[PDB]
Design a protein that fits this description.
This is part of a larger assembly, with chains A (about 250 residues), B (about 110 residues), C (about 110 residues) and D (about 45 residues).
Chain A (H helix, E strand, L loop, with lengths): L1 E11 L3 H12 L4 E12 L20 E5 L33 H7 L2 E5 L11 E9 L10 H8 L1 E15 L5 E11 L2 E4 L4 E10 L5 H17 L26
Antiparallel strand pairs in A: 1-5, 1-9, 2-3, 2-6, 3-4, 4-5, 6-7, 7-8, 7-9
Chain B lengths: L3 H36 L5 H32 L6 H20 L6
Chain C lengths: L1 H27 L18 H40 L5 H17 L1
Classes of the chains: A alpha+beta (about 250), B mainly alpha (about 110), C mainly alpha (about 110), D alpha+beta (about 45).
Chain lengths: ~250, ~110, ~110, ~45
């Protein structure tokens, strides 16, 4: 469980290369390639959860995220082994098509994660969100599989998507991510972040009670934002967009 | 050494201030000639037109070229890093020295 | 920023042109003009204050020309400085090399 | 994955033969009859 303090933004791919150089001028570090695959699961509507205390609202149903890393050998087509595995490959990832299709992901079926809507009030300068996390290491039995496990808990699959981007590690534990997101269905693959990169700068705090640390984290994030003034505008997203409860449906992408 | 683009940029700038110096010098000669023109000898009268014309054409195109340079500044935007490899190159040379130490036939 | 420098050089050039025309007309009609017609407007009322106004013109044109040229030169150097500063930009053989080095030291130690 | 991490891993691993702990092993076989040959293996280490 962490308090994640975050700021968001977006950029057009035209400046992409330039942006990268500037980051290396500041951090002093080179970018590192990465990828991931997230699957979202929701409580089964076939089961009537009368246990939701309607007269008191002790709790509301929520959605579970399962993440995993996928090797690049599934994301590189027959035209791309010649180039080395570095960040420049992202320049060729502008098409809505991608080597990883629905059948391979179905064949695949980790990190389990749950979150809450950010803190209310208009006196917050950065998006503060609470995250509860655990890890699944292995399994066994006659039906050892992620799908069977989540159906045993009482959850069913809803959708999935694939993230590819680069990471920058700066001082004080600040992490800056440049991402491209591909939604995947049997109908096909569609790039929601079409013609651009999604930028997200964030820090993690282990204990929410410590307030000196939280103040330091906010100071670092606002200093970073004030450093990038004039190039990219980093902003607090909409509090109602980062809500992932089942009752109301929307997805920040 | 610097990349060539900066080299011709600095050459153009140097040409700019040399042209400015030439403009100042020509101002000096035109001020000189106007004195004797006021004195009353008409022999150097034809030279006056040439001096004035060259002075004005030196004043104009210099500013024009400087304007071009400042314009180049407009579109040139968007177009310790060495440390990231610095240790590496140091590493390389050290091993090279070891090679020179390792072979006694090359120490001459 | 750069647009401000553009504008500043603009008044720089127009001021050069205007002061040039002013000193030209002043020195050309420095010979005082007497015309009986009322249309002409040239007055020399107090004798020596005429020379005072003349040296006034001299000092003004000198100071303004020198200052403008020096300002332009400093501007050019500033541009060049901005140009310079602001523009942000086998293993196996080593294995036997170290093996020979270590065995040589072991023998020689 | 990324080129930089693999490059650094390769360059660091290149120095294993120097940085690693030295070891030695000596096997002594004593000639004995009656097909009964004892062995004496002594390994020397500097942990």
């Amino acid at each position: 469980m962490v308090q994640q303090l975050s700021l968001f933004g977006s950029i057009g791919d035209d400046g992409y290369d330039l942006l990268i150089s500037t980051l290396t001028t500041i951090s002093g570090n080179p970018p590192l390639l990465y990828n991931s695959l997230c699957t979202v699961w929701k409580p089964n509507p076939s089961y009537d959860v009368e246990n939701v205390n309607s007269r008191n609202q002790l709790v509301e149903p929520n959605r579970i995220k399962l993440s995993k890393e996928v090797p690049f050998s599934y994301l590189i087509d027959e035209t791309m082994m010649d180039k080395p595995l570095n960040f420049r490959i992202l320049k060729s990832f502008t098409n809505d098509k991608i080597p990883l299709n629905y059948a391979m992901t179905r064949n695949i079926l980790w990190s389990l994660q749950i979150s809450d809507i950010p803190a209310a009030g208009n006196n917050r300068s950065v998006s503060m969100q609470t995250i509860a996390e655990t890890i699944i290491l292995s399994s066994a039995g006659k039906n050892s599989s992620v799908s069977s496990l989540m159906n045993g808990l009482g959850y069913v699959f809803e959708f999935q998507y694939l993230t590819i981007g680069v990471k920058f590690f700066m001082k004080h534990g600040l992490i800056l991510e440049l991402q491209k997101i591909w939604q995947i269905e049997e109908a096909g693959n569609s790039q929601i972040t079409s013609g651009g990169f999604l930028l997200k700068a964030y820090i993690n705090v282990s204990r929410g009670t410590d307030i000196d640390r939280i103040n330091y984290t906010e100071t670092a994030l606002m200093n970073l934002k004030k450093e990038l003034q004039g190039y990219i505008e980093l902003s607090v997203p909409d509090r109602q967009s980062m809500d992932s409860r089942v009752a109301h449906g929307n997805i920040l992408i | 050494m610097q990349p060539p683009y900066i080299q011709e940029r600095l050459k153009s700038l140097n040409d700019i201030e040399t042209q400015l110096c030439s403009m100042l010098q020509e101002a000096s000669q035109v001020t000189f000639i106007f004195g004797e023109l006021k004195r009353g000898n008409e022999s150097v009268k034809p030279q006056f037109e040439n001096h004035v014309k060259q002075f004005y054409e030196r004043l104009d195109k210099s500013t024009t070229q400087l304007r071009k340079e400042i314009q180049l500044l407009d579109e040139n935007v968007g177009t310790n890093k060495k440390a990231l490899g610095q240790d590496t190159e140091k590493m390389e040379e050290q091993l090279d020295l070891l090679s020179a130490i390792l072979d006694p036939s090359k120490s001459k | 920023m750069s647009n401000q420098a553009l504008y500043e050089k603009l008044e720089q050039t127009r001021t050069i042109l205007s002061v040039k025309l002013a000193e030209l007309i002043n020195m050309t009609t420095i010979a005082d003009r007497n015309d009986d017609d009322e249309g002409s407007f040239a007055q020399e009322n107090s004798e020596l204050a005429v020379a005072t106004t003349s040296v006034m013109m001299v000092n003004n044109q000198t100071m303004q020309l020198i200052k403008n040229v020096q300002d332009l030169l400093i501007l050019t150097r500033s541009i060049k400085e901005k140009w310079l500063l602001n523009q942000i930009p086998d293993e196996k053989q080593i294995e036997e090399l170290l093996d020979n080095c270590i065995e040589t030291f072991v023998a020689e130690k | 994955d990324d080129e930089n991490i693999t490059k650094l891993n390769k360059e660091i691993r290149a120095f294993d033969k120097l940085l690693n702990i030295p070891r030695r092993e000596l096997k002594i076989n004593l000639p004995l009859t009656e097909h009964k040959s004892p062995n004496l293996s002594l390994m020397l280490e500097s942990p």
